[PDB]
Amino acid sequence: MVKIRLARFGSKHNPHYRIVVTDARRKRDGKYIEKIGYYDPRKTTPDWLKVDVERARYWLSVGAQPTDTARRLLRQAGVFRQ
Amino acid sequence: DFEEKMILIRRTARMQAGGRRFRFGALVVVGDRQGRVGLGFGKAPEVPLAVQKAGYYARRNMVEVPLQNGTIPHEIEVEFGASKIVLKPAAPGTGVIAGAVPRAILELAGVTDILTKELGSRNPINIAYATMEALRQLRTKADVERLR
Amino acid sequence: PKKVLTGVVVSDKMQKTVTVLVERQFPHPLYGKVIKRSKKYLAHDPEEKYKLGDVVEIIESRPISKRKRFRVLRLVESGRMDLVEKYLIRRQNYESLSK
Amino acid sequence: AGXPHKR
Amino acid sequence: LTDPIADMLTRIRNATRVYKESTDVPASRFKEEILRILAREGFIKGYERVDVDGKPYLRVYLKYGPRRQGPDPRPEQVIHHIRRISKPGRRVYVGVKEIPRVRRGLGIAILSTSKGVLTDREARKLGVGGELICEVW
Amino acid sequence: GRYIGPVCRLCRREGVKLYLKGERCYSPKCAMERRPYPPGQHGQKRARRPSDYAVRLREKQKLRRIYGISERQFRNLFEEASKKKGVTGSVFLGLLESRLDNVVYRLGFAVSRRQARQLVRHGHITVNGRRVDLPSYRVRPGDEIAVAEKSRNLELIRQNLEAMKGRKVGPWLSLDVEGMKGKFLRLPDREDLALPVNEQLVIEFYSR
Amino acid sequence: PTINQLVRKGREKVRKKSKVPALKGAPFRRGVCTVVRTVTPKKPNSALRKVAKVRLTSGYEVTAYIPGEGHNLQEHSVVLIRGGRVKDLPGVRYHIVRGVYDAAGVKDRKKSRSKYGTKKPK
RNA sequence: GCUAGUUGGUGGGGUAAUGGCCCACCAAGGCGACGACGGGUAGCCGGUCUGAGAGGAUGGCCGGCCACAGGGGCACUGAG
RNA sequence: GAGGAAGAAGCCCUUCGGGGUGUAAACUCCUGAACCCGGGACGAAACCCCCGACGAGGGGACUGACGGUACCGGGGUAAUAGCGCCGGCCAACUCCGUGCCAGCAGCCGCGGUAAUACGGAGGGCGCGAGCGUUACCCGGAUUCACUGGGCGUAAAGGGCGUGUAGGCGGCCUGGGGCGUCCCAUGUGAAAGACCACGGCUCAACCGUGGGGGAGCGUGGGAUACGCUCAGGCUAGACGG
RNA sequence: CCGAGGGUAGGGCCCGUGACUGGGGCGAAGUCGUAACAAGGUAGCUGUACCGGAAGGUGCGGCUGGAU
Numbered sequence A: 001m002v003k004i005r006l007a008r009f010g011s012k013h014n015p016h017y018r019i020v021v022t023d024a025r026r027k028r029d030g031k032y033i034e035k036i037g038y039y040d041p042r043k044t045t046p047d048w049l050k051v052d053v054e055r056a057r058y059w060l061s062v063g064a065q066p067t068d069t070a071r072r073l074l075r076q077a078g079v080f081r082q
Numbered sequence B: 001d002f003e004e005k006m007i008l009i010r011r012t013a014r015m016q017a018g019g020r021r022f023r024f025g026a027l028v029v030v031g032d033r034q035g036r037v038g039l040g041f042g043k044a045p046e047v048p049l050a051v052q053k054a055g056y057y058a059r060r061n062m063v064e065v066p067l068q069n070g071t072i073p074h075e076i077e078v079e080f081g082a083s084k085i086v087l088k089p090a091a092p093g094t095g096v097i098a099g100a101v102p103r104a105i106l107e108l109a110g111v112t113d114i115l116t117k118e119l120g121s122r123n124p125i126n127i128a129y130a131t132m133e134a135l136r137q138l139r140t141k142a143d144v145e146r147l148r
Numbered sequence C: 001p002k003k004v005l006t007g008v009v010v011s012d013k014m015q016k017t018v019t020v021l022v023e024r025q026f027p028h029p030l031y032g033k034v035i036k037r038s039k040k041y042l043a044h045d046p047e048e049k050y051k052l053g054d055v056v057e058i059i060e061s062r063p064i065s066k067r068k069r070f071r072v073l074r075l076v077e078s079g080r081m082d083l084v085e086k087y088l089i090r091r092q093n094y095e096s097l098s099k
Numbered sequence D: 001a002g003x004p005h006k007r
Numbered sequence E: 001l002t003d004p005i006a007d008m009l010t011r012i013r014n015a016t017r018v019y020k021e022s023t024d025v026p027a028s029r030f031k032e033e034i035l036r037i038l039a040r041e042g043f044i045k046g047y048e049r050v051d052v053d054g055k056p057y058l059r060v061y062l063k064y065g066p067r068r069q070g071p072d073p074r075p076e077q078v079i080h081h082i083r084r085i086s087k088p089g090r091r092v093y094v095g096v097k098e099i100p101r102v103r104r105g106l107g108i109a110i111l112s113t114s115k116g117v118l119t120d121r122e123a124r125k126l127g128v129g130g131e132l133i134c135e136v137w
Numbered sequence F: 001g002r003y004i005g006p007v008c009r010l011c012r013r014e015g016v017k018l019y020l021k022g023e024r025c026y027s028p029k030c031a032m033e034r035r036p037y038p039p040g041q042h043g044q045k046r047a048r049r050p051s052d053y054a055v056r057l058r059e060k061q062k063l064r065r066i067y068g069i070s071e072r073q074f075r076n077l078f079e080e081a082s083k084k085k086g087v088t089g090s091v092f093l094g095l096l097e098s099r100l101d102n103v104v105y106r107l108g109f110a111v112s113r114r115q116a117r118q119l120v121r122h123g124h125i126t127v128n129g130r131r132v133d134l135p136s137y138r139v140r141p142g143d144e145i146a147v148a149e150k151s152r153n154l155e156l157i158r159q160n161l162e163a164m165k166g167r168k169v170g171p172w173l174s175l176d177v178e179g180m181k182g183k184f185l186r187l188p189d190r191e192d193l194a195l196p197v198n199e200q201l202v203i204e205f206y207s208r
Numbered sequence G: 001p002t003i004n005q006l007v008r009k010g011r012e013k014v015r016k017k018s019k020v021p022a023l024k025g026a027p028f029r030r031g032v033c034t035v036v037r038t039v040t041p042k043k044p045n046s047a048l049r050k051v052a053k054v055r056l057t058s059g060y061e062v063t064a065y066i067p068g069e070g071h072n073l074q075e076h077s078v079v080l081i082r083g084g085r086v087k088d089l090p091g092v093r094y095h096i097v098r099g100v101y102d103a104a105g106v107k108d109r110k111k112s113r114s115k116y117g118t119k120k121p122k
Numbered sequence H: 001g002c003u004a005g006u007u008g009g010u011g012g013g014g015u016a017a018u019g020g021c022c023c024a025c026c027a028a029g030g031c032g033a034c035g036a037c038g039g040g041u042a043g044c045c046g047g048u049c050u051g052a053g054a055g056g057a058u059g060g061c062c063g064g065c066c067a068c069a070g071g072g073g074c075a076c077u078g079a080g
Numbered sequence I: 001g002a003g004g005a006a007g008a009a010g011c012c013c014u015u016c017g018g019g020g021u022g023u024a025a026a027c028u029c030c031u032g033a034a035c036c037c038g039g040g041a042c043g044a045a046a047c048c049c050c051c052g053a054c055g056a057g058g059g060g061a062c063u064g065a066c067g068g069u070a071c072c073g074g075g076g077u078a079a080u081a082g083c084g085c086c087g088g089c090c091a092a093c094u095c096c097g098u099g100c101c102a103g104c105a106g107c108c109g110c111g112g113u114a115a116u117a118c119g120g121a122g123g124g125c126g127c128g129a130g131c132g133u134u135a136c137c138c139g140g141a142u143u144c145a146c147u148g149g150g151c152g153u154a155a156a157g158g159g160c161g162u163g164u165a166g167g168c169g170g171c172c173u174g175g176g177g178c179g180u181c182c183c184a185u186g187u188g189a190a191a192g193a194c195c196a197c198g199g200c201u202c203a204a205c206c207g208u209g210g211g212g213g214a215g216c217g218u219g220g221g222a223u224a225c226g227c228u229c230a231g232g233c234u235a236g237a238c239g240g
Numbered sequence J: 001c002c003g004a005g006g007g008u009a010g011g012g013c014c015c016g017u018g019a020c021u022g023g024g025g026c027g028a029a030g031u032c033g034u035a036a037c038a039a040g041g042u043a044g045c046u047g048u049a050c051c052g053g054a055a056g057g058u059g060c061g062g063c064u065g066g067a068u
Ligand code: SF4
Pocket: F007, F008, F009, F011, F012, F017, F018, F019, F020, F021, F022, F024, F025, F026, F029, F030, F031, F032, F033
């Protein structure tokens, strides 16, 4: 399945993820299909999370599956607001 | 007045029965750093006299070098036989990028920013002459417009 | 788009197949000059209606056989045996190149 | 390599 | 004769160095378009169609500087340098972004485009590249 | 690390008075005003005509020994100015001045950059409120360099801030003596500082 | 040459020939001494240079130079060699690294010690 | 100089699918100085190093694709 | 770190007057790497349970290998320096020892009884937890020359014709639009590089955003030049 | 039927090595002569041919990069 997950960039002890759509069989930091936003878990900058939300819903509509901790960062960005 | 730089001092020699009778030569460039340069080659039986004649001949032969904000107006290629000098105008922050022989002539010209390259024979004497003829051939938009 | 080429026919000696000699021009990547380079394509002539000297267009298509990957698309000119002679003279000059 | 050989 | 254009430039370059008043070249429309730009840019006085032994020629009238002083009183050239770029051996085609600035503006680059023969400044302002014919200063 | 060795021989070689000590630089005990010839057995012999390479090397060692900075950091700064826009001469000087340990000296907190370094290195300094113990910190416009609260009361800083009630400070800088504060106003222009150094001769040294 | 001639033939990349073939792309190479003798140099020098003929791990057997005053090298000595020739000894293309394997450092060096395998004295 | 499944055709097998990929037969074709065939070396690229640029050199780490899993051959299971 | 003598001892040079290492040390005071104590993380809020509807949205709880680490606070000792080089290129010189020896050497070259070139010493230059050496790549090398080279005598015109492929090709007019030029459009992944800003105390490292090309696909256009097709000319060429 | 490969037989290419043999390069002070550089003491060089310890000599033709 196509999924929506965190591809850890950054450096050692300096986590910086990109919320990204990729194939589940692709490697974690591998070639993704599209970037839909970034996420700084350590909250070292005013905007440590950001989601397109329009695109995050397209892939969601066509069958992409978020991760469990990626589902939150799309919830916390209000992707699911009815 | 004009400022003097000694580019080259060499000891040549002739032959006669009894051995080598020597002689000395001096490349000296002279200029005001405001747009006047001069090159002279002085040859004498001793070093100071040759440095003397060189400066004298140098003031006898000068050149306008139309500076424009410290650089030259246009790029130029000049060959003084087997020796070739490239002069390219540069931006105000660059500097004088040249071998010792052209640099001496460009700094006393008042050139503060330029790009250069010596090609072919790097004989300092002929590089010096090739540098002078290049400056001597620099024109301005005024010179160009006034000609056409 | 299926690539479309143009070339003469240098061989009719196969069943339902003709050899189309395409040439192209391009500037030398280093020396700039415009140079010629040619390439033979084995084209599909299922009606066996094309003959020597015909300048034709071929179109990329699904494999008919090994090596056969283009179909003849349309005639363009006819009786250009002057180009065919150029090809044949060259191939003929190869006999003078051995040892 | 039979059987004797030549080499 | 393999390059009528290279011939013309060279036919001029030799006349200017012996300080000829004029020099005739075999006539062609494309040469006229080239000489039209040398006259309009001041490198020559101009040109006029002529006939020599019944043959169409282009007489070109040459310019020089004032009589100089010193041991050699030969005027400065108005054409210091005229040189073929594109040739029958290697044609040279530049896009508009690739057109060279001849002699940092003190010279021109003649080049043929589908809007006509133009100078480096004319092409860049008109926005088209083409075959770089030559360079003059 | 840094040079850490005898410092009056530096001035005697460079032929120019570099202010690397402190008060002694102004006294008649200054080695330069006392034996203004290069160190060693041959310092009093008659100098032979230096080469162009010698001249450029001498300028570079001059500028560098002024700041007490190692050749690595010195050139990495030089190369940074080469890439950036504008005249490389000024920018290389500005970035040299922007070093924290140079500001702390240029603000009179210490009488020598070598002492200003130890001030920064032992933490007695802060920037914009935060402690900063890195002598290489590139100070930006607007930063408020001050003495550490826990270190405001210390004989060396007082005596230095005392003798600073007298002097003025450069146009690009600001200082409040009573509150031990200081402010970096702008990037120094070329004419805003007169070092005994022809920076073009340092450019030309690296163009080789 | 014409531009067409260049299209046809092109320019030939100049190739460079190694001056240390026995190393076989290595920075250094181990060997064993077979002949440890002295050789006279060519004009205009006169001396008795110290040379070891070394049999390498790379299949080659070459003559290496033994730099410095005095050496402990004899037959069957294991030796590491480096590039570098001795200009005045034709055929010697390599130097023995001192302070490595059975090649002792130079006794009582003070200057340029690291080039001769001698440790710092107290 | 190279080529007998070689090059094309017909029919058929085979596969998710085109194809001499495979078999039967018929035709005598296919390729080559624009370097076929053969020999040597090499995994290719984003890039990396140098260089005024043009260029040269390189492809380790990271990302993309390919290839192999002691040396070979083989199929099975299966969306693969 | 600051101070600290017309300037200790030692060692080096000397014309025996002196000069050097050198404010260097000693010494004085200031600071306080390490270490000692105390507190102590960001990375971790989801899955889950709760209400609502097992949803949208609310509110709740458990979880850290790194680690008692970073970092903060309090205390606290003056605390490793080495390596290359000093004939010219190339920045840095004197003494002794040696006597074509022992040795140096990247090239030119040094050493034959006064060696700034060998070996040591003093001094000096350059870098600094590095400094050198070897190997290899690009540069200087415009020394494979497209940019940007040459061939009378420096290396380089084929012994000379004839001619195949190929490369190139005069003046004028028109058709096409292949080269070529222009505009639009698709692709040119991320990373990297570059500019801007920001996060680790700075930096390296790392995050965010900006700027794009060339090449190729497509669509539209221009036609001077090169190409092709067609028609005419006579200055090249051939013939009478 | 095909089939890894094993086996028989005969070819081609490459690498290493070999009694002995051929010249090559290099090596401070060996032996023989003096061919070349001056008209170098027979102008030199040359393709070829033959000869001779060795440089070389001679023939045939060529070149001036030959003195006077
Ligand atoms: S200034 Fe006088 S005292 Fe201060 S360092 Fe330079 S020489 Fe020594």
